[PDB]
Amino acid sequence: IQRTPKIQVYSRHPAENGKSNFLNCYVSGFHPSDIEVDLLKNGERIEKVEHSDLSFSKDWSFYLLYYTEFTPTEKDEYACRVNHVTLSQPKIVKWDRDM
Amino acid sequence: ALHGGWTTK
């Protein structure tokens, strides 16, 4: 009845520190639609984050894309924090260069 | 364009 979200953290283009890129957190396969997604830099919430308009797949599960412009730094840590009714505590998925 | 016909369920 309630489906837990599937979280993927990735970049739009191959990462290159010093060069502007896009940080994506793709959340899919969840139901109901109410969800909390925040992009984190070194643990703190990135304030200017945009998201796509709610849509759903053939199985009626929802998907959303949260994104923000970031200039990656190999010392800076980036992650995605997702909270949903199917989760007892907010889940944090960190960005890995090879996902 | 959007459809303009609505019958209640």
């Binding site: 009845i1 993927q8 896009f22 109410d34 759903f56 | 364009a1 959007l2 459809h3 303009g4 609505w6």
Partner: protein, 274 residues
Amino acid sequence: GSHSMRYFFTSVSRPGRGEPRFIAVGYVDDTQFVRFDSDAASQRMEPRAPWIEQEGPEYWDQETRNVKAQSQTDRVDLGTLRGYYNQSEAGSHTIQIMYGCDVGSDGRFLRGYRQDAYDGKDYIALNEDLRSWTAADMAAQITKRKWEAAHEAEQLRAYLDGTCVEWLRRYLENGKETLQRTDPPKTHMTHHPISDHEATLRCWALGFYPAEITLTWQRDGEDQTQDTELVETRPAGDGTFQKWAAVVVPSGEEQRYTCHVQHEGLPKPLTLRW
């Protein structure tokens, strides 16, 4: 090739917190071009692709009124279906609707569709013949009798194989510089040791449009249906899509594994080996 126009609707009841949240999205293929959010400031159908902005104020007045009537219709249905399933007024529930039409490369009608859901499960659906309905349970059968008597299928068919095809043809013409391109996948493989004796071979596919794709890992002819991690296709945020698949192989045996990529923009299925 083939093309599609689909509209997606979501209505989520907010018990004791205001009117239900209503979000509508229009797509041509995998490209959003219109949107409506009941919590947004404009309270109008808004453009989301460059080629739709040339439509005049009468177009945006018509789409705004129609998308709001769909929202009001879902408000009634949220309360009605809550009674069908003997549910309390205290819970939040969801109605999801999708309809649209497909055309070929010559612009000819291929198929039309409409499917409705309640709380993430099938409720009622229009059959391919665009004349008969299929209800998922006995509660949805009540709606089916109400729609059969009102002859809703006939009026909906006139849109699905008529008006829907008409506008899709116009959109494909107005956006022929951006809607008629298929980008092939850029492919590469990576190797990540997990220990002194095993490694993760990951097969990559980037920048492909449309989103449909197939990645399979083979090992000496046999296909590793299992022992294979395959993530869901994901958007890059620029119009293209990404997907990878990985297998954990024994160190020194990477040459016995093969990745295979199948996309419409590829003249032959790509075969990759580490």
